[PDB]
RNA sequence: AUGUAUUAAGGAGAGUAUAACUUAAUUUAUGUUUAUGAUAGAGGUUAUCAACAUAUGAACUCUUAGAGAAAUUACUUAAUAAACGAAGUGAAUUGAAAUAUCUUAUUAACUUCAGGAAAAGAAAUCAAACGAGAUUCUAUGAUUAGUGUGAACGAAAAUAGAGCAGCCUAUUAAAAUAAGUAAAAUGGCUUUAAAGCUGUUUGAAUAUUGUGGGGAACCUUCCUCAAAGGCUAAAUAUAAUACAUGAGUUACAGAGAAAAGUACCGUGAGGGAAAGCUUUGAAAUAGUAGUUUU
């Protein structure tokens, strides 16, 4: 009894009903069998478009400094909805 | 000022437990680890803030201020001018500073 | 009113060495003798 | 709501105490190993120092046994040869504390205002090639070094193995570096008595005319000389080039645009709002109306608690209640200027007479 | 590096839009220009 | 799930703790997949191999004569 | 003279004896939390 | 160490551009001044070559729903340490050169409740024949009056300073002016025998047109105040942060900690290090050399 006692017990350390999960989440609910239904209302899906035809990378070339937004006499310039709203009158006003 | 302060051993940190056995050792007996005899002890008669200040009768004390004023008296160190003892410092200068045209660095 | 007092003057711009054209001019290789500033 | 103010400002101050508590050690961390790196740079320096005493006196001794000592082995205590210094002291890549930075720009203005650009002809003031005249060639503003490829400013340097081939020589020659505290600017001033164009050895420089753009976060600024008011034009210095790679996306790609608002559905899947920030976060701030009003309700539940009681006051308890409603809806009598004459007569007679 | 902080400026713009999209409603509840009842046609350019 | 040796948090100082474990999953595709064989010690200069070994060599040498020191020993 | 207490022990004895739960749940147990919290420890149980 | 100012819930786990801090771990904007500042270039990773001020995106897990072997489960826009305060309960070491009363001591400690402070508070108070005018903190009064066989314990008036605030219509919402109360006997506490607190058994009066309480056994006259209903800031305590000062420390010092409640010890409560830098190199100790003796 010593040095390694004193750590953070883990599941790799002891058996006879010690659990600890990873935060995977609930996928389903336990049986009185002891076995496990899905419920793929929990289960989670990955929603990725079509990547065909996209010409967009995640890199800018150099030649095209960076530059920021300037809303001079704004405070809060590209969080104003007033902007957003007299912008969206312009360009669409049916939706 | 006065603010010197040391810690006895009855303010060092740690436990007041018994270190070692009275007896069957064969070393030397000891009490608590803040002990003066020890490595990180306490210092016993250490500095502690009090104040350092005496008395002196306010007539002893006038007639000291009396007595240096005559000590300089006697020897032609002492100097009374009229009202008004400032420098003289140049008009031009003086004019100058006030308008802020003189840089700091200049100025002094 | 004019003081006694000398102040700097007005900051002037300095040639820079590609636009020097004086004939007799030649660059240093020693600051050994060269006026500082 | 206010309660929920208190909330954000109470967990911003938490987070924001622990996270000095660590910067707070973790800079006396890096500070205490690149202390103890920087040590091995002079204490090589103090072994040499030492080694030149012992040198000096066994020259003088022995005349003709003077010991070949460019022939001997390394110094194990440091690695380097005869004569040689090590990569580390000869292209001084020693981090130094922030203080030296300040102080070894202090003629040349501030570290982060540098009046001194690369391309501008110096002179060495400090060391053994003092009056040295060489032109810049790079500069380097972490440790404030400068590095000028003259001739005479080359020193032999012990060339680690790590990087060397066995076929190779050990020892090379190599520009050193030197702090920009140990030389001066040159430059030629027009001579306004003789009209002649003399180089001139300048002490100190400062910024003027500066000015910021804040949407692209760049400088432009201008150096002069103290006490003569002589604006130094920059130096001839070759911007970066900038290049189109294929993995980047084209300029005509970038600048189009494919936003339009919306005002009747999301600017994207209510979903995508619980991705990009925590809906159960302590820092949350903007709350749904229903939300609100539930938070408002407890607190009101608990003084409607407070007020309970009323139901079980007495006849008599109400009755006194009820009194200091009217009594203090009365008011307090007001003093008329006719009583207030009345009462000044009072005081000048007895004051006065 | 770089491929990171494009997805931070991904997530910046959109949680920009979010916001700004719920105070606009908010403030379009009182602009007498616009009819939030109506979706068919909602905008009415004031003379 | 792999785990990760129980470690100080400076290295030689400070308290006992231990990182995240690491996750691996091995999938059974539907359809086959051959890696390619590492390119040999010869054609990997495009990654500066050459200057990488002698690095590492002298990275192999100092942790082999660190060992030595930790055994209580010294090279005669 | 000491004796070999620890032969044989299960390290779900110490979870039940010293574990945090064992102390947060408890009149005295929360005392000693605080205790070793005022004191700045960082292992506050097993 | 003290003082001043401000503030009034604290920690941990894991992760991350290893000055940069929360899976967005170096967000996005506004204004002003920019070397006469503040106190006519180059440079977007070869980065952050700009400070101040005002806003702003993000901010995980546990302590902290339930359960559990804290950092898991399962759910969800679930969330408050210490110290300080008041009351209740309440020792012993010790001193008396033993020791019971006493002292230690309305102490330590524990429990409950509460806030940024709390408590207390505008006289049923003190004085003495003159008068003062709530509470709180410090000093003097005072090794005093006094108590005790002793050892020792120990006020108040008044004075000075810090603060100053009065009210019930309380600047937050309360009284129809207080009866099982005042008081007595008895058992205790406090204590000088009074006053004050209290279990048991009993049990009043109605205002200076002299009703009630107090003025140190007790009675009387007089003086003084008006219980059995309440509100009230400041000066005070504690902790954190910042700053100022030093005949304070300068590395076995200062702090326990110049990388610390870490390492390490212990089943546990708990105990608890060493360790600065590039300078200087004393003694002891070891192997040699020179001179000399053996
Ligand atoms: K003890
Ligand atoms: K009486
Ligand atoms: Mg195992
Ligand atoms: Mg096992
Ligand atoms: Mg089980
Ligand atoms: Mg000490
Ligand atoms: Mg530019
Ligand atoms: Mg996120
Ligand atoms: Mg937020
Ligand atoms: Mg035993
Ligand atoms: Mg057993
Ligand atoms: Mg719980
Ligand atoms: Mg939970
Ligand atoms: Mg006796
Ligand atoms: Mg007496
Ligand atoms: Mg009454
Ligand atoms: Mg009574
Ligand atoms: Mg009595
Ligand atoms: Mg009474
Ligand atoms: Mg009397
Ligand atoms: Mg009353
Ligand atoms: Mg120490
Ligand atoms: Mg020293
Ligand atoms: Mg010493
Ligand atoms: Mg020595």
């Known amino acids: 009894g010593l040095k390694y006692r004193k750590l953070r017990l883990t599941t790799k350390d002891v058996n006879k009903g010690f659990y600890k999960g990873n935060r995977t989440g609930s996928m389903g609910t336990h049986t009185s069998y002891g076995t496990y239904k899905i419920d793929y209302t929990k289960v989670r899906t990955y929603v990725c478009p079509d990547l065909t035809g996209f010409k967009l990378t995640p890199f800018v070339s150099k030649t095209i400094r960076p530059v920021h937004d300037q809303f001079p006499g704004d405070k809060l310039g590209p969080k104003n909805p007033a902007t957003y709203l007299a912008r969206w009158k312009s360009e669409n006003g049916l939706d | ?93 003086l004019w100058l500073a006030g308008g802020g045209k003189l840089s700091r660095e200049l100025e002094d | 009113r004019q003081v006694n007092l000398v102040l700097p003057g007005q900051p002037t711009r300095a040639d820079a060495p590609e636009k020097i054209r004086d004939p007799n001019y030649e660059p240093a290789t020693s600051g050994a003798g060269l006026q500082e500033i | 709501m206010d309660k929920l103010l208190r909330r954000v400002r109470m967990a911003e101050g938490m987070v924001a105490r622990r996270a000095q508590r660590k910067n707070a050690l973790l800079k006396r961390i890096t500070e205490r190993k690149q202390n103890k790196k920087n040590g091995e740079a002079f204490t090589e320096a103090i ?160 910024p003027r005319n500066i000015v910021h753009d804040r949407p692209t976060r760049t400088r432009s600024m201008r150096r002069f000389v103290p006490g003569e008011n002589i604006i130094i034009p920059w130096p001839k210095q070759e911007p970066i080039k900038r290049e189109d790679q294929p993995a980047d996306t084209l300029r005509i790609d970038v600048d189009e645009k494919t936003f339009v608002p919306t005002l009747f559905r999301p600017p994207a899947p209510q979903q995508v709002l619980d991705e990009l920030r925590n809906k159960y976060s302590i820092f949350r701030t903007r709350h749904t109306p229903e939300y609100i009003a539930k938070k408002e309700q407890e607190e009101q539940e608990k003084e409607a608690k407070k007020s309970a009681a009323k139901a079980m006051l007495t006849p008599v308890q109400e009755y006194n209640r009820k009194q200091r409603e009217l009594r203090r809806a009365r008011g307090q009598p007001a003093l008329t200027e006719e009583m207030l004459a009345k009462i000044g007569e009072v005081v000048a007679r007895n004051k006065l007479g | 590096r770089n491929v990171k902080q494009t997805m931070r400026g991904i997530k910046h713009v959109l949680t920009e839009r979010f916001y700004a999209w719920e105070d606009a409603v908010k403030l379009a509840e009182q602009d007498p220009e616009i009819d939030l009842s109506n979706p068919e046609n909602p905008y009415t350019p004031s003379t | 799930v792999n785990q990760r040796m129980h470690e100080q948090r400076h290295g030689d100082v400070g308290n006992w703790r231990r990182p995240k474990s690491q996750k691996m999953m091995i999938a059974e595709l539907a359809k086959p997949f051959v890696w390619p064989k590492p390119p040999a010690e010869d054609a990997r200069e495009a990654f500066d191999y050459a200057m990488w070994k002698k690095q590492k060599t002298a990275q192999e040498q100092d942790t082999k004569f660190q060992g030595i020191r930790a055994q209580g020993e010294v090279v005669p | 003279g000491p004796r070999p207490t620890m032969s044989g022990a299960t390290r779900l004895v110490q979870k039940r004896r010293h574990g945090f739960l064992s102390r947060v749940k408890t009149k005295n147990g929360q005392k000693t939390l605080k205790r070793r919290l005022a004191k700045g420890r960082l292992r506050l149980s097993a």
């Open chain 2, 1 to 93: 000022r006065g603010m010197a302060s040391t810690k006895t051993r009855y303010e060092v940190h740690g436990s007041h437990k018994k270190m070692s056995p009275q007896k069957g050792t064969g070393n030397a007996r000891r009490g608590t680890r803040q002990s003066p005899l020890m490595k990180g002890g306490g210092k016993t008669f250490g500095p502690k803030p009090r104040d350092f200040s005496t008395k002196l009768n306010k007539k002893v004390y006038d007639l000291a201020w009396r007595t240096a004023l005559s000590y300089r008296y006697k020897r032609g160190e002492l100097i009374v001018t009229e009202d008004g003892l400032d420098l003289p410092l140049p008009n031009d200068f």
């Open chain 4, 47 to 206: 072994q040499q120092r030492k080694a030149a005493v012992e040198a000096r006196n066994e020259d003088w001794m022995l005349g003709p046994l003077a010991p070949r000592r460019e022939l001997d082995e390394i110094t194990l205590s440091n690695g380097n040869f005869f004569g040689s210094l090590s990569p580390t002291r000869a292209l001084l890549e020693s981090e130094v504390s922030e203080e030296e930075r300040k102080a070894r720009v202090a003629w040349c203005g501030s570290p982060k205002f540098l009046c001194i650009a690369p391309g501008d002809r110096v002179v060495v003031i400090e060391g053994h090639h003092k009056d040295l005249i060489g032109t810049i060639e790079k500069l380097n503003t972490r440790n404030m070094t400068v590095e000028i490829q003259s001739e005479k400013l080359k020193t032999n340097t012990t060339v680690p193995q790590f990087m060397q081939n066995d076929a190779d020589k050990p020892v090379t020659q190599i520009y050193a570096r030197l702090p920009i505290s140990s030389v001066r600017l040159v430059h030629p001033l027009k001579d306004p008595q003789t009209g002649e164009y003399r180089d001139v050895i300048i002490r100190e420089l400062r």
